[PDB]
Symmetry: none
Subunit: 349 residues, 2 copies
């Protein structure tokens, strides 16, 4: 029996701007996982958002800041003309048109508003623990509404003291959008948003160290001033490929013989695997649950440049077809759709 869901997106920026982080990939993929099982999914997101096949409603207003002004002590903030506030006002007005509302935003207000809704509200958490106000908002809604909080990885849940009461739904992609490439060029890839402390420096240095050009995909929003700054490695070393569509990304990415992930503190690793692309990552966080050591990638001692360069040297030992097979066996929409229902359908009753 089929149901009607409303997905409320992140307020940090529009779907398609590259500003929403992983939610920009997760939300449409989870929506498609559910509609392919006969459900209706509508999306509510900031003005300027795009979404190819689904009902979308947008609301103008000021985007939610990402800044941690006081570390773990920074309060929740609602600016004038807040888009987050307007999104949840709009959701509330139409709450009776849906069986369940799914919140994708890492913010205090949707959690606080949950008992103010008659329609059930579930929360897919996309970040690890960052602030006291957020930890407490999530815990409160866990206490009141068991099973209402999901996460993407065990590593992510482990950053929360209540992590064991969060349901882990893992990750998935629309694999039919991604082509397997068995014949890479002698280049490395990096995917992410192009901004300070995103690990991008570690990747360039390692790829350079290894004698391989680094190709870089993502959104440029310290532009070019953070970016051009980094031609302190030379266009010798690093090659911006743009912020592109998924189809452009997969055909470009699949040409790399490896993907470097060098973050600090999920989709991107799977996107590489889906193209046949092994992943070299710091042994830290979400990649530990995606990559199979020495089979679909290399998980290496974090912050060690010789480790990255050693791993780059062992890329051709990895079977690209295995990487693609792992993506199909583990990260399909069809299985994510099953996990979504096991999570959300009990929340209806």
């Amino acid at each position: 029996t089929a149901h009607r869901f409303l997905f409320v997106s992140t307020p940090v920026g529009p779907l398609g701007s590259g500003r929403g982080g992983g939610v920009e990939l997760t939300l449409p993929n989870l929506a498609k996982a559910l509609t392919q099982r006969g459900h209706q999914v509508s999306v509510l997101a900031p003005a300027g958002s795009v979404l190819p096949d689904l009902p979308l409603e947008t609301v103008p207003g000021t985007w939610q800041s990402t800044a941690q002004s006081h570390g773990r002590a920074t309060p929740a903030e609602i600016p004038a003309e807040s888009v987050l506030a307007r999104l949840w006002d709009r959701a509330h007005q139409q709450q009776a048109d849906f069986d369940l509302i799914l919140n994708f935003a890492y913010d205090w207000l949707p959690l606080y508003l949950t008992p103010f809704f008659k329609t059930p509200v579930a929360h897919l958490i996309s970040m690890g623990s960052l602030s006291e106000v957020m930890d407490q908002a999530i815990a409160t809604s866990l206490d009141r509404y068991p099973g209402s909080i999901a996460v993407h990885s065990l590593a992510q849940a482990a950053t929360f003291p209540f992590g064991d009461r969060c349901l882990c739904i893992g990750n998935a992609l629309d694999l039919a959008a991604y082509g397997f490439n068995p014949e890479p060029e002698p280049v490395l890839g990096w995917v992410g948003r192009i901004a300070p402390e995103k690990g991008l420096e570690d990747a360039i240095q390692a790829a350079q160290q290894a004698g391989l050009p680094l190709r870089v995909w993502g959104a440029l929003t310290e532009p070019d001033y953070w970016q051009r700054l980094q031609q302190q490695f030379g266009d010798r070393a690093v090659s911006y490929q743009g912020f592109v569509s998924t189809d452009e990304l997969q055909r470009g990415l699949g040409r790399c013989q490896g993907l470097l992930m060098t973050p600090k503190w999920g989709n991107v690793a799977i996107e590489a695997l889906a193209c046949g692309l092994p992943v070299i990552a710091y042994a830290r966080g979400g990649p530990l649950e995606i990559i199979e050591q020495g089979k679909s990638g290399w998980l290496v001692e974090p912050d060690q440049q010789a480790a990255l360069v050693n791993a780059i040297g062992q890329l051709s030992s990895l079977d690209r077809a295995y990487c693609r097979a792992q993506a199909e066996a583990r990260f399909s929409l069809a299985a994510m759709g099953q996990r979504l229902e096991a999570w959300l359908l009990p929340l209806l009753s």
Copy 2:
């Protein structure tokens, strides 16, 4: 009665960085051992340090090298911008806010400065004898201040001529962070750097001879080493479990029927065995270094001849002789923060006033 302590951390690297050596683990546990009795503990440590729930002040400067340029005759060295010198200058400024200052650094300077403080200074010596200058600084402090020097193990103490005048406070960890697992999977564990010259081959070959998969926890630096192990021992034989947090390590380690410890002697101290015991996991270790003072032969593990396959295999086959609940009971009785807090009070309280 409750007292106020200042802990001055190691200069070799920041707390919570991975680059501070063993003090990185001991200092937070010994601090917690005292604050769980109602004492106050504040910490001075290098810039970049991270230490939850305790007053922490950090100090900029160059880390202290651990390397000796010519062995036991190496002088004590103070580089420009020495973080060690700055730590002890700052501790001196604030000495009157505390009843006692506890030094964790293995260095000449804090011992030399002890008579220049009005507040008592105690010293936790975390390593064995390495230099004439350090031996003599410790011996002089013992002569002037009997009872002011502690060590973690009796082995360490005996590398010193005055070892019998040092107090041994043993080891502890935060057992509340470790879950007792009475029902393991039929697997073995091994914890350490996934790198050559770590005894990992010894552990793999013995687990394989015994018919048991080996799970490993630790950092991989050379991916070709991983392939070399696959080529030598087969594509199973060793299963990578992660480079993971303390809470993740204990959840996975607890699932093993035994922990194999095969380190070279210079790395055979000693705390991973306590983590295994705290999970109910008996320990099979080479019979040298720190494990000799952790494991009870034939009760909480097996202490075996080093570098001998047959001895590891024989021990793996007697894991069933060992009571996992007894392993946990020994951790609670011997290696708890509660036990450590009592030893610290017995050591430090007579030094007050």
